[PDB]
Amino acid sequence: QFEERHLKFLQQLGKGNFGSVEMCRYDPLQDNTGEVVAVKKLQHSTEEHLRDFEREIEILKSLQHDNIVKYKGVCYSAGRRNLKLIMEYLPYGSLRDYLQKHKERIDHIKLLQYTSQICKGMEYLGTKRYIHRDLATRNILVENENRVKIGDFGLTKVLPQDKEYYKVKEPGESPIFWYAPESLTESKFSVASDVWSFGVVLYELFTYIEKSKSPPAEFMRMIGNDKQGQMIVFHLIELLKNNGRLPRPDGCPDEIYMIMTECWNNNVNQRPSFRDLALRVDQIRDNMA
Numbered sequence: 300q301f302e303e304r305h306l307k308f309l310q311q312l313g314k315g316n317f318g319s320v321e322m323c324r325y326d327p328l329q330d331n332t333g334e335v336v337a338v339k340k341l342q343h344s345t346e347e348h349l350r351d352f353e354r355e356i357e358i359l360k361s362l363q364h365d366n367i368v369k370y371k372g373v374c375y376s377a378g379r380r381n382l383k384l385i386m387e388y389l390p391y392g393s394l395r396d397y398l399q400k401h402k403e404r405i406d407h408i409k410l411l412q413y414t415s416q417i418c419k420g421m422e423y424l425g426t427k428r429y430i431h432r433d434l435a436t437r438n439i440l441v442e443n444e445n446r447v448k449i450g451d452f453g454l455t456k457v458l459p460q461d462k463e464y465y466k467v468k469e470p471g472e473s474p475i476f477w478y479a480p481e482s483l484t485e486s487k488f489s490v491a492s493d494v495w496s497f498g499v500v501l502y503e504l505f506t507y508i509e510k511s512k513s514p515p516a517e518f519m520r521m522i523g524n525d526k527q528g529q530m531i532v533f534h535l536i537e538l539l540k541n542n543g544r545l546p547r548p549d550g551c552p553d554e555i556y557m558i559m560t561e562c563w564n565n566n567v568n569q570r571p572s573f574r575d576l577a578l579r580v581d582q583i584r585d586n587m588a
Protein backbone atom coordinates (compact mmCIF):
# COMPACT_ATOMS: atom_id res chain seq x y z
CA GLN A 300 0.00 0.00 0.00
CA PHE A 301 3.01 2.25 0.65
CA GLU A 302 5.03 3.17 -2.44
CA GLU A 303 8.78 3.38 -1.93
CA ARG A 304 9.17 6.63 -3.89
CA HIS A 305 7.13 8.54 -1.28
CA LEU A 306 9.08 7.32 1.78
CA LYS A 307 11.49 10.09 2.80
CA PHE A 308 14.24 9.02 5.19
CA LEU A 309 14.64 11.20 8.28
CA GLN A 310 16.81 9.37 10.84
CA GLN A 311 17.60 5.94 12.23
CA LEU A 312 15.62 4.97 15.33
CA GLY A 313 17.15 1.62 16.29
CA LYS A 314 18.91 -1.54 15.17
CA GLY A 315 17.79 -4.96 16.37
CA ASN A 316 18.11 -8.53 15.11
CA PHE A 317 19.04 -8.71 11.40
CA GLY A 318 17.97 -5.21 10.45
CA SER A 319 17.11 -1.70 11.54
CA VAL A 320 14.23 0.74 12.06
CA GLU A 321 14.09 4.19 10.43
CA MET A 322 12.09 7.36 10.99
CA CYS A 323 10.45 8.33 7.69
CA ARG A 324 7.72 10.62 6.41
CA TYR A 325 5.31 9.08 3.91
CA ASP A 326 4.55 12.14 1.77
CA PRO A 327 2.67 10.95 -1.34
CA LEU A 328 1.45 14.47 -2.14
CA GLN A 329 5.05 15.77 -1.83
CA ASP A 330 3.81 18.85 0.07
CA ASN A 331 5.12 17.98 3.57
CA THR A 332 1.69 16.94 4.86
CA GLY A 333 2.19 13.19 5.22
CA GLU A 334 2.48 11.43 8.55
CA VAL A 335 5.74 10.28 10.12
CA VAL A 336 6.00 6.48 10.23
CA ALA A 337 8.44 3.84 11.46
CA VAL A 338 9.98 1.61 8.79
CA LYS A 339 11.70 -1.70 9.60
CA LYS A 340 14.08 -3.22 7.06
CA LEU A 341 16.59 -6.05 6.89
CA GLN A 342 20.23 -5.00 6.78
CA HIS A 343 20.97 -7.94 4.45
CA SER A 344 18.20 -9.86 2.68
CA THR A 345 19.06 -13.51 3.06
CA GLU A 346 16.26 -15.86 2.02
CA GLU A 347 16.25 -17.25 5.57
CA HIS A 348 16.01 -13.77 7.10
CA LEU A 349 13.49 -12.81 4.40
CA ARG A 350 10.98 -15.57 5.18
CA ASP A 351 11.47 -14.92 8.90
CA PHE A 352 10.76 -11.24 8.18
CA GLU A 353 7.67 -12.18 6.17
CA ARG A 354 6.45 -14.31 9.08
CA GLU A 355 7.07 -11.42 11.48
CA ILE A 356 5.02 -9.12 9.23
CA GLU A 357 2.12 -11.58 9.20
CA ILE A 358 2.29 -11.96 12.99
CA LEU A 359 2.14 -8.21 13.66
CA LYS A 360 -0.60 -7.65 11.07
CA SER A 361 -2.79 -10.15 12.97
CA LEU A 362 -2.33 -8.40 16.35
CA GLN A 363 -4.84 -5.70 17.37
CA HIS A 364 -4.29 -4.58 20.97
CA ASP A 365 -3.85 -1.29 22.80
CA ASN A 366 -0.40 -2.42 24.03
CA ILE A 367 0.93 -3.79 20.72
CA VAL A 368 2.56 -1.48 18.18
CA LYS A 369 0.19 -0.86 15.27
CA TYR A 370 0.91 -2.38 11.87
CA LYS A 371 0.33 0.03 8.99
CA GLY A 372 1.41 -1.78 5.83
CA VAL A 373 4.27 -3.03 3.69
CA CYS A 374 6.47 -1.60 0.94
CA TYR A 375 8.79 -3.24 -1.59
CA SER A 376 10.71 -2.35 -4.76
CA ALA A 377 11.94 -4.17 -7.93
CA GLY A 378 9.30 -6.89 -8.20
CA ARG A 379 9.23 -7.90 -4.53
CA ARG A 380 12.74 -7.01 -3.34
CA ASN A 381 13.70 -4.87 -0.32
CA LEU A 382 10.72 -5.70 1.86
CA LYS A 383 9.88 -3.02 4.43
CA LEU A 384 7.46 -3.07 7.37
CA ILE A 385 5.52 0.16 7.98
CA MET A 386 4.46 0.74 11.58
CA GLU A 387 3.09 3.57 13.68
CA TYR A 388 5.72 5.97 15.00
CA LEU A 389 5.75 6.20 18.80
CA PRO A 390 7.28 9.57 19.68
CA TYR A 391 9.03 8.77 23.00
CA GLY A 392 11.15 5.85 21.80
CA SER A 393 11.99 2.65 23.62
CA LEU A 394 10.99 2.21 27.25
CA ARG A 395 14.61 1.52 28.21
CA ASP A 396 15.83 4.91 26.98
CA TYR A 397 12.68 6.70 28.18
CA LEU A 398 12.95 5.37 31.73
CA GLN A 399 16.67 6.19 31.93
CA LYS A 400 16.08 9.81 30.91
CA HIS A 401 13.02 10.59 33.08
CA LYS A 402 14.00 8.39 36.04
CA GLU A 403 13.57 11.22 38.57
CA ARG A 404 9.91 11.87 37.62
CA ILE A 405 8.67 8.27 37.14
CA ASP A 406 7.49 6.79 40.43
CA HIS A 407 6.65 3.20 41.36
CA ILE A 408 2.93 3.59 40.62
CA LYS A 409 3.89 4.59 37.08
CA LEU A 410 6.17 1.56 36.75
CA LEU A 411 3.32 -0.76 37.76
CA GLN A 412 1.09 0.90 35.15
CA TYR A 413 3.67 0.01 32.50
CA THR A 414 4.02 -3.45 34.07
CA SER A 415 0.27 -4.09 33.86
CA GLN A 416 0.06 -2.96 30.22
CA ILE A 417 2.92 -5.28 29.23
CA CYS A 418 1.14 -8.19 30.94
CA LYS A 419 -2.15 -7.57 29.13
CA GLY A 420 -0.29 -7.39 25.83
CA MET A 421 1.59 -10.60 26.63
CA GLU A 422 -1.65 -12.35 27.60
CA TYR A 423 -3.09 -11.30 24.23
CA LEU A 424 -0.09 -12.96 22.57
CA GLY A 425 -0.74 -16.17 24.49
CA THR A 426 -4.34 -16.38 23.27
CA LYS A 427 -2.90 -16.52 19.73
CA ARG A 428 -0.32 -19.13 20.86
CA TYR A 429 2.52 -16.72 20.08
CA ILE A 430 5.84 -16.94 21.93
CA HIS A 431 7.63 -13.59 21.91
CA ARG A 432 11.06 -14.94 23.02
CA ASP A 433 12.62 -11.44 23.21
CA LEU A 434 10.88 -9.58 26.04
CA ALA A 435 13.03 -6.68 27.29
CA THR A 436 12.58 -2.97 27.95
CA ARG A 437 14.62 -2.16 24.84
CA ASN A 438 11.82 -3.89 22.89
CA ILE A 439 9.02 -1.92 24.59
CA LEU A 440 8.00 1.42 23.09
CA VAL A 441 6.43 4.49 24.71
CA GLU A 442 3.46 6.10 22.97
CA ASN A 443 2.88 8.71 25.68
CA GLU A 444 3.56 9.01 29.41
CA ASN A 445 0.58 6.75 30.23
CA ARG A 446 0.85 4.02 27.58
CA VAL A 447 3.53 1.59 26.38
CA LYS A 448 3.44 -1.04 23.64
CA ILE A 449 5.34 -4.22 22.81
CA GLY A 450 7.20 -2.96 19.79
CA ASP A 451 9.17 -5.73 18.09
CA PHE A 452 8.43 -9.34 17.14
CA GLY A 453 11.46 -10.44 15.11
CA LEU A 454 11.97 -13.59 17.20
CA THR A 455 8.29 -14.42 17.78
CA LYS A 456 7.24 -17.99 16.94
CA VAL A 457 3.89 -19.75 16.68
CA LEU A 458 3.40 -22.78 18.91
CA PRO A 459 2.76 -26.11 17.19
CA GLN A 460 -0.88 -27.10 17.53
CA ASP A 461 0.06 -30.32 19.38
CA LYS A 462 2.74 -29.05 21.79
CA GLU A 463 3.05 -26.24 24.32
CA TYR A 464 6.69 -25.44 23.54
CA TYR A 465 8.74 -24.43 20.51
CA LYS A 466 12.31 -25.69 20.06
CA VAL A 467 14.68 -23.45 18.10
CA LYS A 468 18.33 -22.39 18.22
CA GLU A 469 19.19 -19.25 16.27
CA PRO A 470 22.76 -19.01 14.91
CA GLY A 471 24.25 -15.85 16.39
CA GLU A 472 24.11 -14.04 19.72
CA SER A 473 21.10 -14.69 21.97
CA PRO A 474 19.91 -12.51 24.88
CA ILE A 475 20.99 -15.20 27.33
CA PHE A 476 20.60 -12.95 30.39
CA TRP A 477 16.84 -12.80 29.75
CA TYR A 478 16.51 -16.52 28.92
CA ALA A 479 14.82 -19.12 31.09
CA PRO A 480 17.06 -22.05 32.12
CA GLU A 481 15.23 -24.53 29.89
CA SER A 482 15.84 -22.11 27.01
CA LEU A 483 19.59 -22.13 27.72
CA THR A 484 19.83 -25.92 28.15
CA GLU A 485 17.21 -27.32 25.75
CA SER A 486 16.36 -24.30 23.54
CA LYS A 487 12.72 -24.70 24.61
CA PHE A 488 10.54 -21.59 24.36
CA SER A 489 7.03 -21.37 25.79
CA VAL A 490 4.59 -19.04 27.51
CA ALA A 491 6.35 -19.94 30.76
CA SER A 492 9.72 -18.86 29.35
CA ASP A 493 8.15 -15.55 28.33
CA VAL A 494 7.04 -15.29 31.97
CA TRP A 495 10.65 -15.78 33.07
CA SER A 496 11.72 -13.00 30.70
CA PHE A 497 8.91 -10.77 31.96
CA GLY A 498 10.38 -11.11 35.44
CA VAL A 499 13.65 -9.74 34.09
CA VAL A 500 11.71 -6.87 32.49
CA LEU A 501 10.17 -6.15 35.89
CA TYR A 502 13.69 -6.16 37.33
CA GLU A 503 14.85 -3.74 34.61
CA LEU A 504 12.07 -1.26 35.38
CA PHE A 505 12.89 -1.06 39.08
CA THR A 506 16.61 -0.57 38.47
CA TYR A 507 15.60 2.46 36.35
CA ILE A 508 18.12 1.18 33.78
CA GLU A 509 21.04 2.05 36.00
CA LYS A 510 24.61 1.58 34.85
CA SER A 511 25.92 -1.26 37.02
CA LYS A 512 22.49 -2.83 37.66
CA SER A 513 21.73 -4.30 34.22
CA PRO A 514 21.07 -8.07 34.10
CA PRO A 515 24.25 -8.69 32.06
CA ALA A 516 26.31 -6.67 34.56
CA GLU A 517 24.79 -8.40 37.59
CA PHE A 518 25.05 -11.90 36.12
CA MET A 519 28.61 -11.50 34.85
CA ARG A 520 29.72 -10.30 38.29
CA MET A 521 28.02 -13.23 40.03
CA ILE A 522 29.70 -15.79 37.74
CA GLY A 523 32.87 -13.69 37.73
CA ASN A 524 33.97 -11.45 34.87
CA ASP A 525 36.71 -14.05 34.32
CA LYS A 526 34.46 -16.29 32.23
CA GLN A 527 35.16 -16.41 28.50
CA GLY A 528 32.95 -17.07 25.48
CA GLN A 529 30.94 -20.28 25.77
CA MET A 530 31.85 -20.75 29.43
CA ILE A 531 29.58 -17.77 30.12
CA VAL A 532 26.39 -19.68 29.29
CA PHE A 533 27.76 -22.81 30.98
CA HIS A 534 28.30 -20.90 34.23
CA LEU A 535 24.98 -19.08 33.85
CA ILE A 536 23.21 -22.44 33.58
CA GLU A 537 24.93 -23.70 36.73
CA LEU A 538 24.19 -20.46 38.60
CA LEU A 539 20.45 -20.59 37.83
CA LYS A 540 20.21 -24.29 38.68
CA ASN A 541 21.60 -23.48 42.15
CA ASN A 542 18.97 -20.73 42.57
CA GLY A 543 21.34 -17.85 41.87
CA ARG A 544 19.15 -14.87 41.00
CA LEU A 545 19.33 -11.16 40.29
CA PRO A 546 19.26 -9.06 43.49
CA ARG A 547 16.38 -6.90 44.63
CA PRO A 548 16.75 -3.44 43.04
CA ASP A 549 17.25 -0.43 45.29
CA GLY A 550 13.93 0.87 46.60
CA CYS A 551 11.96 -2.08 45.22
CA PRO A 552 9.32 -3.32 47.70
CA ASP A 553 9.35 -6.92 48.86
CA GLU A 554 6.00 -7.74 47.25
CA ILE A 555 7.32 -6.57 43.87
CA TYR A 556 10.57 -8.53 44.21
CA MET A 557 8.63 -11.69 45.11
CA ILE A 558 6.75 -11.41 41.81
CA MET A 559 10.13 -11.49 40.06
CA THR A 560 11.35 -14.49 42.06
CA GLU A 561 8.09 -16.34 41.39
CA CYS A 562 8.61 -15.64 37.69
CA TRP A 563 12.17 -16.98 38.07
CA ASN A 564 11.06 -20.50 39.03
CA ASN A 565 13.22 -23.32 37.70
CA ASN A 566 10.05 -25.46 37.61
CA VAL A 567 8.49 -24.44 34.29
CA ASN A 568 4.95 -25.38 35.36
CA GLN A 569 5.08 -23.46 38.66
CA ARG A 570 5.55 -20.03 37.08
CA PRO A 571 2.49 -17.76 37.25
CA SER A 572 0.24 -16.94 34.33
CA PHE A 573 0.15 -13.50 32.74
CA ARG A 574 -3.44 -13.04 33.91
CA ASP A 575 -2.41 -13.71 37.51
CA LEU A 576 0.55 -11.34 37.11
CA ALA A 577 -1.73 -8.54 35.91
CA LEU A 578 -4.06 -9.25 38.84
CA ARG A 579 -1.39 -9.02 41.55
CA VAL A 580 0.20 -5.96 39.93
CA ASP A 581 -3.16 -4.20 39.58
CA GLN A 582 -4.10 -4.89 43.21
CA ILE A 583 -0.73 -3.60 44.43
CA ARG A 584 -1.18 -0.52 42.22
CA ASP A 585 -4.62 0.09 43.73
CA ASN A 586 -3.27 -0.25 47.28
CA MET A 587 -0.66 2.43 46.58
CA ALA A 588 -3.33 4.83 45.26
Ligand SMILES: C=CCCn1cc(-c2nc(Nc3ccc(C4CCNCC4)cc3)nc3[nH]ccc23)cn1
Pocket residue numbers: 312313314315320337368386387388389390391392393437438439440450451
Ligand atom coordinates in the same frame (compact mmCIF):
# COMPACT_ATOMS: atom_id res chain seq x y z
C1 LIG B 1 11.59 -2.18 19.84
C2 LIG B 1 12.84 -2.21 19.44
C3 LIG B 1 13.19 -2.85 18.09
C4 LIG B 1 13.92 -1.88 17.17
N1 LIG B 1 13.38 -0.54 17.36
C5 LIG B 1 12.19 -0.15 16.98
C6 LIG B 1 12.06 1.18 17.34
C7 LIG B 1 10.86 2.10 17.13
N2 LIG B 1 10.96 3.36 17.53
C8 LIG B 1 9.96 4.22 17.39
N3 LIG B 1 10.09 5.61 17.84
C9 LIG B 1 11.28 6.26 18.38
C10 LIG B 1 12.48 5.60 18.63
C11 LIG B 1 13.57 6.28 19.15
C12 LIG B 1 13.47 7.63 19.43
C13 LIG B 1 14.66 8.41 20.01
C14 LIG B 1 14.44 9.47 21.03
C15 LIG B 1 15.66 10.38 21.18
N4 LIG B 1 16.11 10.92 19.88
C16 LIG B 1 16.34 9.85 18.88
C17 LIG B 1 15.11 8.96 18.71
C18 LIG B 1 12.28 8.30 19.19
C19 LIG B 1 11.19 7.62 18.67
N5 LIG B 1 8.81 3.86 16.85
C20 LIG B 1 8.63 2.58 16.42
N6 LIG B 1 7.56 1.95 15.84
C21 LIG B 1 7.85 0.68 15.59
C22 LIG B 1 9.15 0.45 16.02
C23 LIG B 1 9.65 1.66 16.55
C24 LIG B 1 13.26 1.55 17.95
N7 LIG B 1 14.06 0.49 17.95
